[PDB]
Amino acid sequence: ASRILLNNGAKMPILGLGTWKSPPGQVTEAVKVAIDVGYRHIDCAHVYQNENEVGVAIQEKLREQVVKREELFIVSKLWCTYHEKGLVKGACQKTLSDLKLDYLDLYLIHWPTGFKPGKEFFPLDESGNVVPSDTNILDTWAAMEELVDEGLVKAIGISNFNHLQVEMILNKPGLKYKPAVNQIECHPYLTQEKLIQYCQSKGIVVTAYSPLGSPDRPWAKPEDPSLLEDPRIKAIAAKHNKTTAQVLIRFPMQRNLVVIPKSVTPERIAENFKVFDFELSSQDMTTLLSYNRNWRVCALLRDTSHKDYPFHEEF
């Protein structure tokens, strides 16, 4: 089945296109190709600095009647410098304008960490530390709930929240809407069994980011593990007559996760979508899970001092 049921009653395509690092002069065509080939979920963010260009593609394909808006599932995130109650609505509307939408299917708090508002996405003090905001994530969550009540977003969620932070929202006094999704890093080197189990036990759908290991991450090093070239994973792919990437995408799908591989390459975009025609065995799945090494691509290493930094806790 191509979609999963959220706790807001809407359905979310379990496969989406990521857009972090997608160059602004390539991402319009990437999203047009993705929708042409059958993608119905696009994962976006203001901090990616390319929403206008993603939006151009979405609008053209609506205009062309390639797809209807009801059939698309568009996701964006609230960046850390906009956690203040007075800035949330504005941030959302700028993203909407850029994406040329009148609503988001899903809007996520991008990180539990709030930063000082301003032009800079990573505001620094004179000694190099990121400057935090005094806003806490419970007041940020209430502002996200307002967005629902104003019709700007159909669902709200969180990203990069650890289990104690998910729990804090779940136990927020006067909680109005629970989070629908927690978007976290997840791949065979970071399998996240504990956090996923917790979120799913709570009815919260987990989206797996960097499922291919983010080989274009800016800080990659030639000696890092490589999922795509791990011969153990190659072997499993070979056996199923699929590519390694296809295996890496099918893997979270069979854990009842949503997954959002990024590509701006038309051939790979199509490749990545042909994952609905084969099944990994239970054994394949346990084998993939065994490769966990708690290897994190996205650890926000410029702000490990934040009170709300999520990755000091085990999960």
Ligand SMILES: NC(=O)c1ccc[n+]([C@@H]2O[C@H](COP(=O)([O-])OP(=O)(O)OC[C@H]3O[C@@H](n4cnc5c(N)ncnc54)[C@H](OP(=O)(O)O)[C@@H]3O)[C@@H](O)[C@H]2O)c1
């Ligand atoms: N919530 C957050 O904090 C957060 C954090 C990280 C990522 N994300 C989201 O998750 C998405 C996915 O993560 P990611 O961008 O870090 O990386 P990823 O999706 O794990 O990997 C993308 C890299 O893989 C390459 N690639 C894609 N398909 C391939 C295939 N079939 N064969 C070989 N190489 C392939 C891409 O190349 P080309 O593009 O050159 O084809 C690109 O270099 C992001 O784009 C973003 O939407 C969210």
Ligand SMILES: NC(=O)[C@@H]1C[C@]2(NC(=O)NC2=O)c2cc(F)ccc2O1
């Ligand atoms: N260092 C990190 O872990 C995050 C990763 C991350 N990528 C992503 O998709 N979400 C993120 O927040 C990102 C994206 C940016 F545009 C800029 C910084 C950046 O930092």
